[PDB]
Design a protein around this ligand. Structure first.
Ligand SMILES: *C[C@@](C)(O)[C@](*)(O)[C@H](CC(C)C)NC(=O)[C@H](Cc1ccccc1)NC(=O)[C@H](CC(C)C)NC(=O)[C@H](CCc1ccccc1)NC(=O)CN1CCOCC1
Ligand SMILES: *C[C@@](C)(O)[C@](*)(O)[C@H](CC(C)C)NC(=O)[C@H](Cc1ccccc1)NC(=O)[C@H](CC(C)C)NC(=O)[C@H](CCc1ccccc1)NC(=O)CN1CCOCC1
Ligand SMILES: [Cl-]
Ligand SMILES: [Mg+2]
Ligand SMILES: [Mg+2]
Ligand SMILES: [Mg+2]
Ligand SMILES: [Mg+2]
Lengths: 204, 250, 196, 243, 241, 226, 231, 244
């Protein structure tokens, strides 16, 4: 009945020294029934990464919508959209459905190509922006992720250290939520290289 | 009490000409001279304040208009047509850009939106084209400084420097000799004042000339402090006194 | 809210308390519920703060446009514009408004517009939650053709009692006097009116 | 040339020839007048008896708006009716919103703006009537005359149609000879005389007189038709003055 | 030659219907003048009642748009009243939407934008009027802003409109060349009205009775027109010095 | 949320806490609730966060266009009028509760507006969940003819009362001062009385602690030449 | 000439040529007569055939129990206008329980015709109508022209050669107005009136069309052997 | 009424031609020449700018060659403002197709859609047609490399090599002479520039007068790259082929 917890799933993002990390689980279900263990929730438009939790039909719809919009942006502007600008576009697009919203929890992550500055942001379903220095969490295990991040996180972590921190934050949060887990993916993002890692986790 | 003009008033003639666009360009030719010059660290736009009466207060009539904090516009042709285009250009900068992306549009895309509005008056039912040519100067982070011309057809072109209206043929030749890619903004203002003196008949001073720049950020003109990223408008209209100072070293 | 308007020899006087409530919290203790719709046509507002402000703003607009075209509107005309808005939007509004004004021809007039959007022309009118407690008092003490000083005292004593018994009313007693002489604002503080 | 073929086109003079052509339709119509008196207004009109087969007193030309305004017109009769129908809608919406009956100057501008709107577009034709109208409001008596252009002014006396010059001359004498004013009953008699005198311009066919009036004392500020003995008294007065 | 019937460009880049609307402006054969004092803005206009049958109190080309803004029109009365009603509606709507009184210059801009639309759209004709707006603006002080059938508008130190506008204009130009200031240096509006009437008499070369003139005065927070007797008082003072 | 406004001698000051919440969880510890409508018109927001942002940006956009159209600096009453009519039309569904302040050519102003579209005038005002705690301080220490320094002090004290006593409010105090004839000064994190203590332990992991299945490079670049 | 292309254009002498051309279509139509007394009102119509194999075009249309008309000109326009009258009569009955006054019916037709003469795109109606009725103020006869002008009359005629019948009625005025409580004599006077507009052709059994309405008489149309009595 | 001033833009002549379409084509015949050449391993788009001025900022300028998506580009001949209206519509159609089917739009489907929009303006609405002819250069996995053209009538056709705008008669004869089916991109580049060099109304063909582009399946690891040539790169390819 509650659209935000029919399918399940989580996204977390963190900043480090000259880097950002964004991660998600792989579960899609119909309440108690696990359906898919390959449902990725992180997408990218150029160098800007977007994670989306919530109702899966809206996750897919919004990916297709922001691909559409960022493609047109690039044709007109003759450059890739930046994280700061993309954040505003997400907010604008969510708020225009104020009274019939997409049941989602989006998370933006990336590095501004000009300034080199690490950037993350989160949103509620109607587009309010939370622009955090440290970390952003989203999904059915958001309480769990908040607890893990708030204790495990320290600022200015190197990319390979930041990988360990975000992975342990995701895995341990997922294991305390019935509707999250079934695999996980972690993106480590630097100014001109991006590494993607699939995590071994418990399959229940 | 019906608008029955649902058909085009601009059509192709046997020779391939769009008559109303050509005639609009003729109206632009009769209009007062305006120019634009691009420097390395700025852009300047300028025109003559042709006062219709000495009893009229020419300060109230602004030929040079702010569109966004980093974009300005000047024209040659029909003044009322320009005024409504400035209103629409300011609004479309918000509706089709700032309310979506949270930032002001880059010069080229605002130009593109103005161009679109002018094209539509060249094809839609029951309207004539706009009887103006615009010069739009601006700055944005990724494209730097730029200068664009927009014609009654909706067509637009980027310029290093140009002129439009009355004495544009002579003024463009003058600019070809003086312009180089190493010009500072002060040098471009000096060249703008020299070029404009040729097309003006009567008085030549800060009260009869209207000049604005797209230059450095002006934090003193912002009106508030406390946000490091907001550094102020790059558009600045030069005062009557500031113009007269440069006319002594002329 | 406790509000009233009282006609007298020289014109009309409007009166109100200054309390605005959210549940049992007093959101504003110095509210001005006496609002100008024209130079010498004013209203007392009760019910929703949002609704009565929206209505009053629209009426002020309508009478400003009336004045530009046809000259000064009558108090009856102002009351009719209030009525039209209250009646036609009765399903979506919670507004109890008293309209009071001074003409030179008609002198002081008072019109009350309750929840349904009916209009009632009266020598005086009372309204708002606190008015229930002073029907008895006002009926026994009102006379026609009172003086200015008598009418100020009548309103001061009446709203004093309304404030005393109604928890939804309180603060200062504001008044607005409408005569040929002009527009006078009066204020009366708790230390004055409580000891009456 | 071609400037007169389409409504709302300025000629090189700065004129709208279609409106000036509408005036010719007005000049072609029967004579109608208005007289402002002490506490009201009187309206009168010439009705041409085309045939014996016309029923007397039945084809009424003067029209009431609300209960206090009288309207008479010369020119295309249907265009006049269309304008009065609009006038009635304007008076109704005014009374609906503001309670008080529409003041005469307010009502004059409502007609004026509507007629003027029919000079703004080529998709419509101007009105082929000049309309004399008025009544009693809170500020007293008011008489107006409205042209095809939308132009209107207040009047002491007004006249339009084929006999307008004759009528205008007679009205000008009354203004000079009665500066302190004219009574309502006097104005009815004088209105009958002026229509009879103005009939010399339409003298081929015999005619029927029709009068109406609004007066604060004589009709309680309401529009009424002059009937029976008071009509015959005015006809007798008019018949005596021509002989 | 259908480029002369509707508002499209001629081969010369001209709009003939706009130009012909300017000629309709002088159809009334009336001259108007506007000047600024320290605390006020005065507007005067000729009043001509040719017909004895007319009620002279209803013959006027000065309009009270709002409490602060007055408007004098040069042009035929139907178009004048069209413009008046629209300006009144626009001024009232502005107050409702934005919470303060519409400034004189902003109303002038708005009415000029509407006039521009009639020069660009074919189905609407231009109004054959020139609109002179006057007020004492709370920010800018005494203000004169004038609109025409081209959609042009500008502020003025003083202005004149009508068949003999040039004669009035040069008279005013020459006064301000002497004084070297943008206004009439005078405390009371009564003396500013006397200046306006005097300089119209000098420029037109005609004397005026009380019924030959029509006067409008803008002060802080109100615009009002003078009665015949108020004008007579003005005419007596001019004659006595 | 706790937001306040306080009038003084030559202007007006507004203030706010920096906590935003999602259920009982703190989503952002350093939220910015002081919104610029125009350079000298600012407002403090409480209620539904998306609505307050959207409503300030819409009216701020239209105020900017109105300012350019009229060649005049924007007025607080205009921002107020446009905000209330918009909120009234949406019958409370747009959950924006705002304290609107500023300086303009007419003078200095302070208003509050509620989600249903009602407005109020005052010398001191408070809104949000912590408004009772803040109003208690304001009702105890406010006087007529406050100086700039006294008004900043009173405003921040009123926010502190909300920070300490209301669970809806917390973290830092943001202030904006709008004085007549001066630039508005936005003081972000004017007070910082809630820094977290050092943790007892470092939770940095040894490299290789997390089990990996697959690695791959992600192509973020466009299609290449040659 | 140059001013007859549409109904929205005045000529230089203040004429509307499209309206006048519509008026011409009535003169080409077949003759129809109307007349009344104090008790009854009668329509008499000469119906026209295409040839000997064809039927005779119906001229008379019933609008209500107490009202109806005869047509001359474009028959489809008479159908549109009579349908409008039927609806307005019907609205009066359903909403106010009131038979529509004949005078008010004329006013409604006038205003409907007028709108077509002032707006672009539309055309004037190309038909003239004679409306008879009996209402609360007795018997009535109206003449409608598509210019908008509606006239109440004791008698009249419209169509080709209608001036002959109109003169007869102008002489007979004092006689036929007095035919009260005698429908057959009033019809006789109408049949004798329409005979003054005939040339070459005469009134046969399937040529003639008569209608009557009165005090205790609903609007009824007589055709065929029902009118043989009056030949 | 308004009928008086209606040009009637969507009618047949007695001969069965559309007046406005024919007159629009006459307008296009004066516009700067654009050439498209299709090879086995790519497509070339070459086009001549119309407004030679030394003060025109060339490196930020775009009047001829526009990008529709990553796989499809167009060369314009006619009114630039008219073309930009159509270009933005085509960009949107491509993204609508990508959103719906999760596959890049096939070239012909995009071309047909734009051509249908142009057709509509010739049959209904009473508006003037768009004074534009396009050369479409594109790739998809069905037909591979494709060249199309459309004109104001809304008719479109496919080509191995084609020209639009000025001197097309002369240009098409030269292309028909030197084109062969087994030709490559580097050879097609040379053919495009040589054809413009002979047909041009100017005294000499220079870098500041040209806009140039290639679509190659000669990207890293079997992808398709759109290269819009910079001014210096046009100057280099002019020296390489031996024109300057
Ligand atoms: C005090 C008085 C006797 O009621 C007097 O009439 C005054 C007159 C005003 C100042 C002109 N009225 C009020 O103070 C109203 C009373 C009222 C409340 C609710 C409905 C109708 C009337 N108070 C308000 O309008 C109040 C103003 C805010 C605080 C600025 N608004 C509300 O209380 C708001 C109204 C919602 C509403 C509107 C219309 C119909 C129905 C409901 N209600 C809330 O915010 C509810 N509140 C309940 C407790 O938890 C917080 C939310
Ligand atoms: C905290 C405060 C003391 O109340 C203060 O008023 C601040 C002021 C803001 C920052 C200007 N208000 C908030 O922080 C609001 C409080 C609030 C919550 C819920 C309803 C109304 C008010 N917080 C938010 O608006 C919050 C901001 C996020 C954390 C960035 N958004 C939500 O909690 C969001 C609101 C959704 C909503 C929808 C329709 C009408 C009203 C509100 N709710 C969720 O995110 C809940 N849920 C959605 C599905 O995914 C899981 C989470
Ligand atoms: Cl506007
Ligand atoms: Mg789990
Ligand atoms: Mg399990
Ligand atoms: Mg109490
Ligand atoms: Mg026009």
């Amino acid at each position: 009945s509650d659209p935000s917890s029919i399918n399940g799933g989580i996204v977390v993002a963190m900043t480090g020294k000259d880097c950002v990390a964004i991660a998600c689980d792989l579960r899609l279900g119909s309440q108690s029934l696990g359906v898919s263990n390959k449902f990725e929730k992180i997408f990218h438009y150029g160098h800007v990464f977007l994670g989306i939790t919530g109702l899966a039909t809206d996750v897919t719809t919004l990916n297709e919508m922001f691909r559409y919009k960022t493609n047109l942006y690039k044709l007109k502007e003759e450059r890739a959209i930046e994280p700061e600008t993309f954040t505003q576009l997400v907010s604008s697009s969510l708020y225009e459905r104020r009274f019939g919203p997409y049941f989602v929890g989006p998370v933006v992550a990336g590095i501004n190509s000009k300034s080199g500055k690490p950037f993350i942001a989160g949103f509620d379903l109607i587009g309010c922006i939370d622009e955090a220095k440290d970390f952003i969490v989203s999904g059915t295990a958001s309480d769990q992720l908040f607890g893990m991040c708030e204790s495990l996180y320290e600022p200015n972590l190197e990319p390979e250290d930041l990988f360990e921190t975000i992975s342990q934050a995701l895995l341990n949060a997922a294991d305390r939520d019935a509707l999250s887990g079934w695999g996980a993916v972690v993106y480590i993002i630097k100014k001109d290289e991006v590494v993607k890692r699939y995590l071994k986790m418990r399959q229940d | 009490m019906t608008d029955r003009y649902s058909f085009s008033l601009t059509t192709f003639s046997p020779s391939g000409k769009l008559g109303q666009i050509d005639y609009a360009l003729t109206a632009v030719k009769q209009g007062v001279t305006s120019l634009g010059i691009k420097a390395t660290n700025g852009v300047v736009i300028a025109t003559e304040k042709k006062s219709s009466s000495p009893l009229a207060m020419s300060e109230t009539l602004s030929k040079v208009s702010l569109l966004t904090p980093d974009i300005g516009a000047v024209y040659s042709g029909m003044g009322p047509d320009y005024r409504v285009l400035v209103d629409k250009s300011r609004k479309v900068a918000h509706t089709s850009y700032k309310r979506i992306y949270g930032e002001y549009p880059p010069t080229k895309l605002l130009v593109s939106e103005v161009a679109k509005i002018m094209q539509e008056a060249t094809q839609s039912g029951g309207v004539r084209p706009f009887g103006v040519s615009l010069l739009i100067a601006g700055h944005d982070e990724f494209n730097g400084f730029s200068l664009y011309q927009v014609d009654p057809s909706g067509s637009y072109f980027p310029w290093k420097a140009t002129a439009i209206g009355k004495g544009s043929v002579a003024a463009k030749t003058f600019l070809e000799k003086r312009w180089n890619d190493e010009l500072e903004l002060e040098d471009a203002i000096h060249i703008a004042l020299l070029t404009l003196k040729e097309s003006v008949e009567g008085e030549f001073n800060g009260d009869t000339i209207e000049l604005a720049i797209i230059g450095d950020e002006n934090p003193d003109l912002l009106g508030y402090t406390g946000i490091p990223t907001d550094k102020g408008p790059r558009f600045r209209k030069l005062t009557s006194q500031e113009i007269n100072d440069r006319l002594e070293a002329l | 809210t406790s509000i009233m308007a009282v006609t007298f020899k020289d014109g009309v006087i409007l009166g109100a308390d200054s309390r605005t409530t959210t549940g049992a919290y007093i959101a504003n203790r110095v509210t001005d519920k006496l609002t100008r719709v024209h130079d010498k046509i004013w209203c007392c507002r009760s019910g929703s703060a949002a609704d009565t402000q929206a209505i009053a703003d629209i009426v002020q607009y309508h009478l400003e446009l009336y004045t530009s075209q046809y000259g000064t509107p009558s108090t009856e005309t102002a009351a009719s514009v209030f009525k039209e808005l209250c009646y036609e939007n009765k399903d979506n509004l919670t507004a109890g408004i008293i309209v009071a004004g001074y003409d030179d021809k008609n002198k002081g007039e008072v019109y009350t517009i309750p929840l349904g959007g009916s209009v009632h022309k009266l020598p005086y009118a009372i309204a708002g939650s606190g008015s229930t407690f002073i029907y008895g008092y006002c009926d026994k003490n009102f006379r026609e053709n009172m003086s200015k000083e008598e009418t100020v005292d009548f309103i001061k004593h009446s709203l004093s009692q309304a404030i005393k018994w109604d928890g939804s009313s309180g603060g200062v007693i504001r008044m607005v006097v409408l005569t040929a002489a002009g527009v006078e604002r009066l204020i009366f503080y708790p230390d004055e009116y409580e000891q009456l | 040339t071609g400037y007169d073929l389409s409504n709302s086109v300025f000629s090189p003079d700065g004129r709208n020839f279609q409106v000036e052509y509408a005036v010719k339709a007005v000049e072609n119509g029967t004579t109608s007048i208005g007289i402002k008196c002490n506490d009201g207004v009187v309206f009168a009109v010439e009705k041409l008896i085309t045939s014996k087969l016309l029923v007397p007193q039945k084809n009424v030309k003067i029209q009431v708006v609300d209960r206090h305004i009288g309207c008479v017109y010369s020119g295309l009769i249907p265009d006049g009716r269309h304008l009065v129908n609009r006038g009635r809608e304007e008076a109704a919406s005014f009374k609906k919103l503001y309670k008080t009956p529409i003041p005469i100057p307010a009502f004059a501008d409502r007609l004026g703006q509507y007629v003027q709107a029919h000079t703004l577009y080529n998709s419509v034709r101007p009105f082929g009537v000049s309309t004399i109208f008025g009544g009693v409001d809170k500020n007293g008596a008011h008489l107006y005359m409205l042209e095809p252009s939308g132009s209107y002014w207040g009047y002491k006396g007004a006249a339009t149609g084929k006999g307008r010059q004759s009528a205008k001359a007679e009205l000008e004498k009354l203004v000079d000879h009665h500066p302190e004013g004219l009574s309502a009953r006097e104005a009815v008699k004088q209105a009958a005389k002026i229509i009879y005198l103005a009939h010399e311009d339409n003298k081929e066919k015999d005619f029927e007189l029709e009068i109406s009036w609004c007066s604060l004392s004589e009709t309680n500020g309401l529009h009424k038709f002059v009937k029976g003995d008071l009509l015959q008294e005015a006809i007798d007065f008019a018949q005596k003055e021509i002989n | 030659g259908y480029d002369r019937h509707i508002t499209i460009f001629s081969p010369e880049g001209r709009l003939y219907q706009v130009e012909y609307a300017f000629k309709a402006t002088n159809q009334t054969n009336i001259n108007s003048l506007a000047v600024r004092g320290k605390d006020c803005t005065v507007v005067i206009s000729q009043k001509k009642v040719p017909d004895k049958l007319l009620d002279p109190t209803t013959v006027s080309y000065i309009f009270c748009i709002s409490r602060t803004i007055g408007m004098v029109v040069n042009g035929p009365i139907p178009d004048a009243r069209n413009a008046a009603l629209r300006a009144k509606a626009e001024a009232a709507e502005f107050r409702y939407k934005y919470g303060y009184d519409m400034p004189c210059d902003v109303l002038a801009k708005r009415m000029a934008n509407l006039s521009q639309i009639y020069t660009q759209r074919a189905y609407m004709r231009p109004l054959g009027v020139i609109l002179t707006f006057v007020s004492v603006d709370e920010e800018l002080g005494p203000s004169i802003y004038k609109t025409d059938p081209a959609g042009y508008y500008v502020g003025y130190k003083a202005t004149a409109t009508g068949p003999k506008q040039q004669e009035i204009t040069t008279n005013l130009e020459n006064h301000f060349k002497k004084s070297k200031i943008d206004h009439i240096n005078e405390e009371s509006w009564e003396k500013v009205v006397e200046f306006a009437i005097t300089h119209m008499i000098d420029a037109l070369g005609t004397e005026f009775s009380k019924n030959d003139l029509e006067v409008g005065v803008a002060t802080k927070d109100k615009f009002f027109t003078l009665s015949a007797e108020n004008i007579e008082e003005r005419l007596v003072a001019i004659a006595e010095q | 949320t706790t937001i306040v406004g306080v009038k003084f001698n030559n202007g007006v000051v507004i203030a706010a806490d920096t906590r935003s919440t999602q259920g009982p969880i703190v989503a952002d510890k350093n939220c910015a609730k002081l919104h610029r409508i125009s350079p000298k018109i600012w407002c403090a927001a409480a209620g539904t966060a998306a609505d307050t942002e959207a409503v300030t940006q819409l009216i701020g956009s239209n105020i900017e266009l109105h300012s350019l159209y009229t060649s005049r600096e924007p007025r607080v009453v205009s921002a107020l009028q446009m905000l209330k009519q918009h909120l009234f039309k949406y019958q409370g569904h747009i959950g924006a509760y705002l304290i609107v302040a500023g300086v303009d050519p007419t003078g200095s102003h302070l208003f509050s507006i509620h989600a249903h579209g009602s407005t109020d005038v005052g010398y001191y005002l408070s809104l949000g969940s912590g408004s009772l705690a803040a109003m208690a301080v304001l009702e105890s220490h406010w006087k007529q003819d406050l100086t700039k320094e006294e008004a900043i002090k009173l405003a921040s004290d009123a926010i502190q009362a909300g920070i300490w006593n209301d669970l809806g409010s917390g973290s830092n105090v943001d202030v904006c001062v709008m004085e007549i004839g001066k630039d508005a000064e936005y003081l972000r994190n004017y007070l910082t009385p809630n820094v977290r203590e050092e943790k007892q332990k470092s939770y940095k992991f040894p490299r290789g602690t997390t089990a990996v299945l697959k690695e791959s490079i992600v192509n973020i670049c466009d299609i290449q030449e040659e | 000439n140059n001013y007859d292309g549409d109904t929205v254009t005045f000529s230089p002498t203040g004429r509307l040529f499209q309206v006048e051309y519509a008026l011409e279509a009535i003169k080409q139509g077949s003759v129809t007569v109307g007349l009344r007394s104090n008790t009854h009102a009668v329509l008499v119509a000469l119906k026209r055939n295409a040839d000997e194999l064809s039927s005779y075009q119906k001229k008379i249309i019933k609008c209500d129990e107490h009202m109806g008309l005869s047509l001359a000109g474009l028959a489809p326009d008479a159908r549109v206008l009579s349908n409008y009258l039927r609806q307005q009569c019907n609205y009066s009955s359903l909403v106010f329980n009131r038979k529509l006054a004949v005078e008010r019916a004329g006013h409604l037709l006038c205003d409907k015709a007028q709108k077509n003469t002032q707006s672009y795109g539309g055309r004037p109606y190309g038909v003239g109508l004679l409306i008879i009725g009996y209402d609360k103020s007795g018997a009535h006869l109206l003449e409608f022209q598509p210019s908008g002008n509606v006239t109440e009359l004791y008698g009249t005629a419209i169509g080709a050669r209608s001036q002959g019948a109109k003169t007869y009625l102008e002489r007979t005025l004092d006689t036929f107005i007095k035919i009260d409580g005698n429908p057959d004599e009033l019809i006789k006077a109408g049949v004798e009136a329409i005979s003054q507009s005939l040339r070459d052709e005469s009134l046969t059994v399937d040529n003639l069309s008569i209608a009557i309405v009165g005090k205790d008489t609903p609007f009824t149309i007589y055709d065929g052997e029902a009118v043989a009595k009056y030949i | 009424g308004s009928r008086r001033y209606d040009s009637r833009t969507t009618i047949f002549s007695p001969e069965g031609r559309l007046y406005q379409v024919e007159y629009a084509l006459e307008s296009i015949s004066h516009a700067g020449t654009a050439i498209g050449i299709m090879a086995s391993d790519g497509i070339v788009l070459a086009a001549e700018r119309k407004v030679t001025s030394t003060l025109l900022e060339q490196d930020t300028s775009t009047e001829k060659l526009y990008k529709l998506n990553d796989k499809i580009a167009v060369a314009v001949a006619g009114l630039t403002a008219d073309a930009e209206i159509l270009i933005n519509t085509a960009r949107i159609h491509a993204q609508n197709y990508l959103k719906t089917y999760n596959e890049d739009i096939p070239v012909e489907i995009l071309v047909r859609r734009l051509s249908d929009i142009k057709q509509g303006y010739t049959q209904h609405g009473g508006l003037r047609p768009f004074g534009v002819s396009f050369i479409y250069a594109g790739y998809d996995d069905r037909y591979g490399y494709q060249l199309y053209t459309s004109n104001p009538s809304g008719n479109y056709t496919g080509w191995k090599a084609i020209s639009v705008g000025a001197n097309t008669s002369a240009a098409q004869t030269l292309l028909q002479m030197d084109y062969k089916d087994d030709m490559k991109v580097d050879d097609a580049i040379e053919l495009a520039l040589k054809t413009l060099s002979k047909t041009t109304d100017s005294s000499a063909l220079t870098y500041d007068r040209l806009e140039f582009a290639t679509i190659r399946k000669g990207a890293n690891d079997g992808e398709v790259y759109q290269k819009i040539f910079k001014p210096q790169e046009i100057k280099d390819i002019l020296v390489k082929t031996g024109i300057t």
